[PDB]
Write a protein that binds this ligand. Sequence first.
Ligand SMILES: CCCCCCCCCCCCCCCCC[C@@H](O)O[C@H](CO[C@H](O)CCCCCCCCCCCCCCC)COP(=O)(O)OCC[N+](C)(C)C
Ligand SMILES: CCCCCCCC/C=C\CCCCCCCC(=O)O[C@H](COC(=O)CCCCCCC/C=C/CCCCCCCC)COP(=O)(O)OCCN
Ligand SMILES: CCCCCCCCCCCC(=O)SCCNC(=O)CCNC(=O)[C@H](O)C(C)(C)COP(=O)(O)O
Lengths: 178, 88, 459, 98, 67, 80, 128, 124, 110
Amino acid sequence: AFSAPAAYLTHQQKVLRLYKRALRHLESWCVHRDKYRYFACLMRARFDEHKNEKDMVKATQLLRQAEEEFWYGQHPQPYIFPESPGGTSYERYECYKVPEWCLDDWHPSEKAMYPDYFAKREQWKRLRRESWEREVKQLQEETPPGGPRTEALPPARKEGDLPPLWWHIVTRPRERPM
Amino acid sequence: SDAPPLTLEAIKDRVLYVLKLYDKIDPEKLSVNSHFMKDLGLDSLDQVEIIMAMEDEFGFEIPDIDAEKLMCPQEIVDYIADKKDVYE
Amino acid sequence: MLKIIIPTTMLLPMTWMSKHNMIWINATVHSLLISLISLSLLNQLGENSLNFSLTFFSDSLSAPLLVLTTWLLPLMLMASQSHLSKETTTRKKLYITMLILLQLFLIMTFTATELILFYILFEATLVPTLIIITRWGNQTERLNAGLYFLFYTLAGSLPLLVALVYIQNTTGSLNFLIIHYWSHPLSNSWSNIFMWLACIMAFMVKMPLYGLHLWLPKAHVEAPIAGSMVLAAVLLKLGGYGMMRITTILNPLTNYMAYPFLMLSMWGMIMTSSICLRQTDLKSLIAYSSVSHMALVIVAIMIQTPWSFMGATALMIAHGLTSSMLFCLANTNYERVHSRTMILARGLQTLLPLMATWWLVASLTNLALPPSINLIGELFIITASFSWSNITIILMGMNMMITALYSLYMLITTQRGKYTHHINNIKPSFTRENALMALHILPLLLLTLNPKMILGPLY
Amino acid sequence: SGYTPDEKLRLQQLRELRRRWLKDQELSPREPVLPPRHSIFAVTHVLIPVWIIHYYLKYHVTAKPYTVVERKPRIFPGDTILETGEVIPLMKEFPDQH
Amino acid sequence: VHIEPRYRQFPQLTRSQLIQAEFFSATMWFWILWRFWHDSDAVLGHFPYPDPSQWTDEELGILPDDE
Amino acid sequence: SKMELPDYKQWKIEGTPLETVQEKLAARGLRDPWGRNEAWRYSGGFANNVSFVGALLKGFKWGFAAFVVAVGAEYYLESQ
Amino acid sequence: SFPKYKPSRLATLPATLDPAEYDISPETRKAQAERLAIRSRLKREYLLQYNDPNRLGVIEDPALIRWTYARSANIYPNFRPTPKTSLLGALFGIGPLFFWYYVFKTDRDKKEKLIQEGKLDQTFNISY
Amino acid sequence: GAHLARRYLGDASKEPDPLRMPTFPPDYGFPERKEREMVATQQEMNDAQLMLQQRDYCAHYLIQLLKCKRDSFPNFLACKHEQHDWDYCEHLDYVKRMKEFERERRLLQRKKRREQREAEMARG
Amino acid sequence: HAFFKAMLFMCSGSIIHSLNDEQDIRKMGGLYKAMPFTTTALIIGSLALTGMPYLTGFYSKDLIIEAVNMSYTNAWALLMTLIATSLTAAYSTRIIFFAFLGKPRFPPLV
Ligand SMILES: CCCCCCCCCCCCCCCCC[C@@H](O)O[C@H](CO[C@H](O)CCCCCCCCCCCCCCC)COP(=O)(O)OCC[N+](C)(C)C
Ligand SMILES: CCCCCCCC/C=C\CCCCCCCC(=O)O[C@H](COC(=O)CCCCCCC/C=C/CCCCCCCC)COP(=O)(O)OCCN
Ligand SMILES: CCCCCCCCCCCC(=O)SCCNC(=O)CCNC(=O)[C@H](O)C(C)(C)COP(=O)(O)O
């Protein structure tokens, strides 16, 4: 969610992700904590059995048949954390998230209430306006001629610089905005 | 009403709690700045079990791409804080 | 009928002699006043129509249509003055003049005593509409749309002219009263079959009948907002009114000449409703919905029962109000984001709540929620069709489902979800837009209390 | 394994900025600067509406035939009518299978 | 009534919720026992079920197969 | 208000099913390094829980006592 | 070993069950890097306008415009009368009309010749 | 159930069919049969508005129960004797129907036994 | 059915709110003691749903099963009705066993 993805997953990343998925589905099957703990240790052991394999081909085939086993034996209804992409509360509070630019269309009578908040907002807007050009120039400096290669962004490097393209990351609404 | 807003201090106490409840980590020599692989001598599977314990702790799931890099307790604290919108 | 007509004509020099900054105010005030005066045609005798003079008469079929026309003019003025702000004074006066001439032609067409005068006014409505579409249309495609709107209409209406003059040569009159009292059966011959077709096809293409409907998405989508409003609310109803009048000289031939038109209208009802489910343009969706509704009206007129005629009248009025409201709602968002694509702006309920309420109410009347008059008309037509044949319920039932589907699809796509992150120029709703929506909606809701007014002559 | 130097530095900078923004979303002690009988519910919500309805039913709705129709009341053997003073005889001396 | 979290311990209980819960459970059981004392017929049946093979042919009116 | 965490030193898996898991895993040459994380689910007020039939019969004692009191009063009242 | 999962149209093949992602060659990795680069260049172009302070309005997307144009206006210029196009057009266009004509005409003929017989149970049917 | 097992698996010829029953005359095996009488008049069941399925041979006890429930209204637990009487009449009606079923079954078995075995004594 | 099914839903809601908007029963542990009143209410509602004698469920459901047993009815429908009557007891049991008995399985911030 926060990190730039890479062009591909390594064998090691695939193996770790399969480890996590197998553990979570096993916990879904093994409801109770002790029984899950037992079978999770058995899983870790069966996983460690092929830990130090040097033949890449046989390691790949082990991973492949392990994925086939996981698919045949997965839980049809695994546990999902409530705010996770399948959870019962996944996007529950998206109707409460209002972008900050809406505050500029407020009537002056609405901004009469909350004077301090809006003064501090004018300060933030000044900051963004005075940082933008340095951000653009820095991004043009640090980027190869054939366009960027990944979605990674550089930090600030000078005295009063801000990390380029920061406004919509810093001014997110909230995750419980009301 | 529901739960009180999380404070970085409660977060970090909780992460350290789960970390000393882990058998492969020395309690009298674990610090908020201890590297998992480098200082405590763990491997990737230990680190995976640690993130899974952290999601069991705080009741929210962490994506695999982001986790690959939570290699010290302070990084877990920062991740949870920036995710749940805690500044203090 | 002169009392309604002269003031409408007066509106013309009143707007040509007004100050540059008062044209909208003056036109709106006096349009509303004219609408109020017209409201007095709803008093109907019962047994027969009110015959003011040899030239004009009003019916219970006619009275609802006239009130809707006069009421639609001020709403068109409210909807127009936003996108016409940059225009010169003379061109704004010309636009208002087009709208006034259109209202004048429409009022006369509905009340003309005889068919030749009805034909002339029914055809005269083409010129201001074409000028509005092609001169004030936003896109390049408007020129093509204008040609489609003109040619489809004339290809139907010229055989009607030939048929009408032939009928007056053989009968001696085209006055509607004489036509009714001296009606005689149409034999089953090739001559009578082609007379039937020439009497029917113009009104069929006006409705439009499925398969002769291709002009309508073009013209209704490429027109300015007031053009679209008058094209959907009133101009489609010329076909229904004319067919209801003309089918008195066509019996008993209609008994079997109606079969292909009934088949086309029922299956094309299903077809256009399904089309609305996969539409990327928001105006295109409202246009096809209009087509689906008018297919129902065509069925009602072709089966020739009192319940079907009552349902057809109610559905014509209700559709005229709802379709105009939906076009105005789409135009507000278009004014914001300058694109007609439906998935461009999403989650608008978070940014504009009262406009979301207007959207919900318009979508609820479009799917004919009881006890709205949309459902009154649809239910009466469905019952008459059931009497005509019990198998029509399958087609009617299917249509009801698909209509609910695409109506709520439009509502959910535009109002719900999360807002597009990039668009940041969605300003609060203006008082003008909210008042326009309310002036569409309040009359429809008010009509439920007194259903008989929009029911028609058969009632 | 883990972040790169630039990744960590940028996350730290963005973190400081975000925490300042969240801190400044707080309200000061004055922010909402706003500009300048016991049985009353049962009488306006139960008593007044039942006055209007009972008036409406008693003098308007029941002023026309067949608007309020009540199914006729059950009669049993041994009952006494109120209007005529009739008495319906009892019912045929049961076989008395006690 | 101010209850605060406890972090891995059994939550804090008030006397009111316990007394009310026990009172209503006991009420349900008392009601069931009272009813079964007074209306045991509604569960066990009241009228005897007859056995058709207990039926003579004199009361049942069939002749002895020679007529 | 402002509580803090109990000492982590107390969560011990002995006397709990986690001890049985530990011994059954030692019988395989394995070990569980997470049991002290779960020990709190068995340690305290969650030590002893009822069975299903004992749960359905929650308020049966008080209810039966009140029922017998009432039917004894019936025994003793229609004697007037 | 275990029963196999076979994909279909409305339930596709999972990525971990795809033999293609376990048979990797250097050309595959170069393709993946090219795709990532294209995604990255597009992302930067979008974020430079998204974060711009002076930008007010709706950022215009040529991909969306291409989609709507292809779905509406580009369809007829690319149409050819083909055996497939013609047969499908005839079927889906006039088939249902004649089907429904047959159904309704048959039903109404039955009902009318049934009325002529004096046999329909039309009592109480005043409204029509 | 056992009657269903006998009818659907055994020879269904030997079991009464619930739809077409009785097939034998009501006076066949009996010398004299007293025809069932009624205690409640048509007018009484019409003035009580019982229901058209509650107007059986037990309806007088139902009128008893209904009048007694209306009379002792607030005490909804006072109509116990009346309810028991109506229930008992209904139970006796039901056992009469069971006797009819059983009577029908025996006759069919008896008729088959006598008819085809006189065919037996006629075949030799 | 209105009474006890509305009560069952309200009990489930109190559970969900107490456990931080969690609805999966696999993460609900021993609440028989932690939520005593909710437990009492859900047990009484489960006993009413299953037709426990002299309860609201009993008059309505036991009479229905009695009438379905003693009428000229489709045999398959009767068999399916009986199997469903057993299924009702089983699902009710699943909720109580999983949600109220055993050890806690929810996160530690109680
Ligand atoms: C895409 C949308 C377009 C709009 C839809 C327009 C619909 C127009 C269709 C007209 C409906 C029917 C027309 C005439 C009714 C019957 C037609 C004929 O086939 O019926 C038989 C007629 O027999 C034969 O069929 C003769 C007609 C065959 C020649 C016509 C060519 C039809 C081919 C289809 C071409 C498509 C036409 C539409 C162009 C777009 C009846 O037998 P008969 O009793 O003896 O004749 C009755 C007339 N009498 C009494 C004077 C004798
Ligand atoms: C936008 C598309 C709309 C297309 C509409 C086209 C169809 C219109 C209906 C038919 C048009 C021509 C009808 C003629 C007008 C009626 C006049 C009339 O009734 O006179 C008839 C004459 O009838 C005719 O001559 C008509 C013959 C047709 C000539 C033109 C053919 C054009 C195409 C005909 C088929 C198309 C009609 C339906 C198409 C609908 C659109 C798809 C009888 O008079 P007599 O000559 O005196 O006969 C008795 C004395 N001996
Ligand atoms: C009920 C749900 C279904 C469950 C079914 C799932 C079945 C799973 C069976 C077991 C799967 C295997 O053995 S998969 C066999 C794969 N073999 C190898 O990976 C050998 C080479 N080892 C390495 O590359 C690294 O050491 C690595 C191991 C990645 C760790 O690295 P760190 O230490 O640097 O983190």
